[PDB]
Amino acid sequence: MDYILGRYVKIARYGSGGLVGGGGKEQYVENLVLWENIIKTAYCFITPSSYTAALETANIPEKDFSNCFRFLKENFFIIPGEYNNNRYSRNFLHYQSYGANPVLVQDKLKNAKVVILGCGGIGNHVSVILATSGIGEIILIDNDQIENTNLTRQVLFSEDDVGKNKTEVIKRELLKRNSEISVSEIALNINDYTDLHKVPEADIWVVSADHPFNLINWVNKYCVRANQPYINAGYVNDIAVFGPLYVPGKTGCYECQKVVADLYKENIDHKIKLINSRFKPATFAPVNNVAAALCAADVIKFIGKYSEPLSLNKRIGIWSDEIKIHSQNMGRSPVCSVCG
Amino acid sequence: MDYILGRYVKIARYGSGGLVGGGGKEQYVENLVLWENIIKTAYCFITPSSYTAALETANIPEKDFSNCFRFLKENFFIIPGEYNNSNNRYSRNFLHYQSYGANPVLVQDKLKNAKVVILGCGGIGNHVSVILATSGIGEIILIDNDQIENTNLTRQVLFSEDDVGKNKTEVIKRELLKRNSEISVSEIALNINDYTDLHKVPEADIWVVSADHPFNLINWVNKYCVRANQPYINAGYVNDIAVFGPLYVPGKTGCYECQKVVADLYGSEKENIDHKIKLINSRFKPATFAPVNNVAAALCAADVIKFIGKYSEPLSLNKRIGIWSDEIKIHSQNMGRSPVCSVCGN
Amino acid sequence: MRTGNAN
Amino acid sequence: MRTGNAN
Ligand SMILES: [Zn+2]
Ligand SMILES: [Zn+2]
Numbered sequence: 001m002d003y004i005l006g007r008y009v010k011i012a013r014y015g016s017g018g019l020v021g022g023g024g025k026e027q028y029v030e031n032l033v034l035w036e037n038i039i040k041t042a043y044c045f046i047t048p049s050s051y052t053a054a055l056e057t058a059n060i061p062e063k064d065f066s067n068c069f070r071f072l073k074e075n076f077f078i079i080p081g082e083y084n085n086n087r088y089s090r091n092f093l094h095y096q097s098y099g100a101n102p103v104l105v106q107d108k109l110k111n112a113k114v115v116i117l118g119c120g121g122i123g124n125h126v127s128v129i130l131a132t133s134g135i136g137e138i139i140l141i142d143n144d145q146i147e148n149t150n151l152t153r154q155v156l157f158s159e160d161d162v163g164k165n166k167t168e169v170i171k172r173e174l175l176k177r178n179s180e181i182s183v184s185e186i187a188l189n190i191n192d193y194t195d196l197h198k199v200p201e202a203d204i205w206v207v208s209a210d211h212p213f214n215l216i217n218w219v220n221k222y223c224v225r226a227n228q229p230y231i232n233a234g235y236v237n238d239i240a241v242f243g244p245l246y247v248p249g250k251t252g253c254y255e256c257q258k259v260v261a262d263l264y265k266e267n268i269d270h271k272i273k274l275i276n277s278r279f280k281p282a283t284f285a286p287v288n289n290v291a292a293a294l295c296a297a298d299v300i301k302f303i304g305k306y307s308e309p310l311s312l313n314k315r316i317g318i319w320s321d322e323i324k325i326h327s328q329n330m331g332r333s334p335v336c337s338v339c340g
Numbered sequence: 341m342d343y344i345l346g347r348y349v350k351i352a353r354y355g356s357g358g359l360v361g362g363g364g365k366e367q368y369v370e371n372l373v374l375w376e377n378i379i380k381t382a383y384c385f386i387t388p389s390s391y392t393a394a395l396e397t398a399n400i401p402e403k404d405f406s407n408c409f410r411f412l413k414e415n416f417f418i419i420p421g422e423y424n425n426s427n428n429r430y431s432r433n434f435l436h437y438q439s440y441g442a443n444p445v446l447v448q449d450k451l452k453n454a455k456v457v458i459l460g461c462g463g464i465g466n467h468v469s470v471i472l473a474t475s476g477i478g479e480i481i482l483i484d485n486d487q488i489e490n491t492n493l494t495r496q497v498l499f500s501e502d503d504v505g506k507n508k509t510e511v512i513k514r515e516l517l518k519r520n521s522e523i524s525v526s527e528i529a530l531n532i533n534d535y536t537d538l539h540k541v542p543e544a545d546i547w548v549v550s551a552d553h554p555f556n557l558i559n560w561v562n563k564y565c566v567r568a569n570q571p572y573i574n575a576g577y578v579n580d581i582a583v584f585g586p587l588y589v590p591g592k593t594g595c596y597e598c599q600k601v602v603a604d605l606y607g608s609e610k611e612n613i614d615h616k617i618k619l620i621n622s623r624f625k626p627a628t629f630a631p632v633n634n635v636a637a638a639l640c641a642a643d644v645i646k647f648i649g650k651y652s653e654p655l656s657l658n659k660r661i662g663i664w665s666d667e668i669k670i671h672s673q674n675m676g677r678s679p680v681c682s683v684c685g686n
Numbered sequence: 687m688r689t690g691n692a693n
Numbered sequence: 694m695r696t697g698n699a700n
Pocket of ligand 2: 594595596597598677678681682683684685
């Protein structure tokens with residue numbers, strides 16, 4: 001069994017010693033002696049090598065090589081040589097860095113079916129990421145037509161596409177970018193709960209349609225009964241939102257913890273309803289794109305099985321006018337009117 | 341002298357009172373009597389109304405109406421009636437501009453007259469350019485000498501399979517113009533091989549810098565930009581962490597070098613060890629992942645739009661911000677001015 | 687994050 | 694965020 005140093009590894013002299021790795025797994029090694037033994041060990045694996053071969057090759061004691069080799073391996077800085085073996089060959093480094101065999105992740109994605117419930121800003125951004133990552137089947141669900149006003153967020157759409165069906169244009173634009181996949185169309189907005197039964201079974205539903213106001217409440221109840229995984233994404237004006245990632249029998253549902261206040265005394269509640277009915281989201285592409293990007297990451301991870309999705313049992317907000325991220329707990333509840 | 345309730349305001353019964361507004365400005369008012377009073381006054385501004393005209397329709401004491409009006413106004417829940425006079429392609433951005441107490445037409449006009457250099461047209465440059473294009477930036481200058489590959493298709497959302505072999509700047513320009521034909525797009529066939537090459541990059545309102553070649557590219561760009569009095573923003577990733585900032589503004593902000601926050605890859609004491617460091621690093625290839633690239637590009641574009649629009653403070657002023665993808669975590673590295681800095685100091 | 691569902 | 698510059 002050969003091992004190889006991942007190309008995503010990098011190091012640097014820093015402080016008392018140095019840094020090993022980039023991104024989340026970056027570790028400051030304080031002991032310079034130890035830091036140096038890690039590089040000496042890592043150097044043996046630039047080209048694939050067995051444990052024993054590299055031990056003789058390294059100019060360091062067996063006891064140190066063991067610990068250093070373990071450190072590298074436990075952090076997936078060095079992976080099984082076979083994992084190094086394409087279109088998606090860019091995403092392969094990402095999966096390797098999490099200790100997954102990229103081919104087996106890629107295979108899972110190819111075998112997956114994803115419903116995109118709403119093809120506005122979020123659906124545009126999610127669908128293209130999933131397509132170019134190699135999600136095997138995509139089901140596009142929307143009945144609205146492209147308007148010029150859409151172009152600000154809905155990245156697949158062009159001035160010449162205005163008037164045409166959203167589902168139609170996404171589909172064409174997707175196949176242009178990844179011809180190896182299959183895309184499906186369903187011309188349908190959810191104006192009535194019963195419209196959900198026209199939504200096909202899938203590995204997961206990406207839910208981002210913003211009308212009616214209680215759409216996520218209709219999806220929640222239906223997906224529980226239907227044992228159907230879903231993830232909500234969107235925004236509350238300037239705050240990007242993604243989660244929860246509902247997993248039947250594993251997570252709480254949207255309704256469990258009641259983290260949200262419903263939009264809709266004689267005199268006041270009529271005035272509230274009037275205000276809320278006039279509501280239009282202050283949409284902004286940067287916010288749309290964040291929610292969509294992280295939504296997409298979670299679906300890839302959920303299906304790929306290589307890392308835990310962030311939005312399991314959580315509804316996550318990222319601010320755009322402050323440096324701030326906040327999650328609301330969506331843990332399971334026995335008192336829930338849907339899945340208690 | 342009319343005021344109008346913004347479309348972007350929503351309210352909800354919650355706790356002992358209720359919520360007012362959505363997003364960052366969301367307020368929870370504890371008192372039920374106050375919250376209901378806020379709803380009553382806001383209801384009076386549904387139609388463009390002066391304070392006196394709206395008050396005339398209120399059924400609450402004037403002192404209360406006055407405090408609620410003040411509340412609503414300070415949070416830009418009600419805005420100057422005129423700010424709502426627009427069918428326009430940029431209309432959905434207008435509610436965003438309104439919500440920060442800005443005149444939408446004025447922000448848009450500042451964007452029209454802006455010139456932005458996209459230095460590097462990879463995954464970041466793709467997402468930033470299209471955000472800026474469809475938001476109405478008047479002039480976008482694309483700078484890259486690379487060609488489109490099949491491996492690009494992961495993050496580079498403008499590119500298609502048929503684009504393989506073509507120049508990046510050429511296809512981006514084409515794809516931008518199909519989205520916003522009202523804007524001007526130019527392209528410059530250049531990769532920064534040496535510091536000297538930077539002189540070939542035109543002046544603009546800001547440079548969006550996302551090219552990662554060579555490895556000290558941002559050090560060159562910074563040094564140059566300090567000496568050229570040129571604002572720039574950096575954006576990229578370090579594998580699974582999305583990175584954007586700093587946004588350098590000559591004389592108002594720290595430069596990349598001020599705080600010395602990032603470690604220099606190649607370099608040690610012992611040569612035996614130094615050679616190995618240099619080889620390990622020379623073989624570095626980033627673990628790219630669209631969601632990470634997209635987050636970095638999105639927040640970068642937001643900062644450019646606010647930098648030029650002037651309606652809210654860019655987030656990455658004096659800061660290099662990281663957003664994690666495998667945990668719920670955001671971290672900013674201080675990049676404020678240092679009097680001691682050998683690049684922009686003394 | 688609390689005022690209604692996500693949009 | 695520390696190991697060299699951003700890519
Ligand atoms: Zn529940
Ligand atoms: Zn400085």
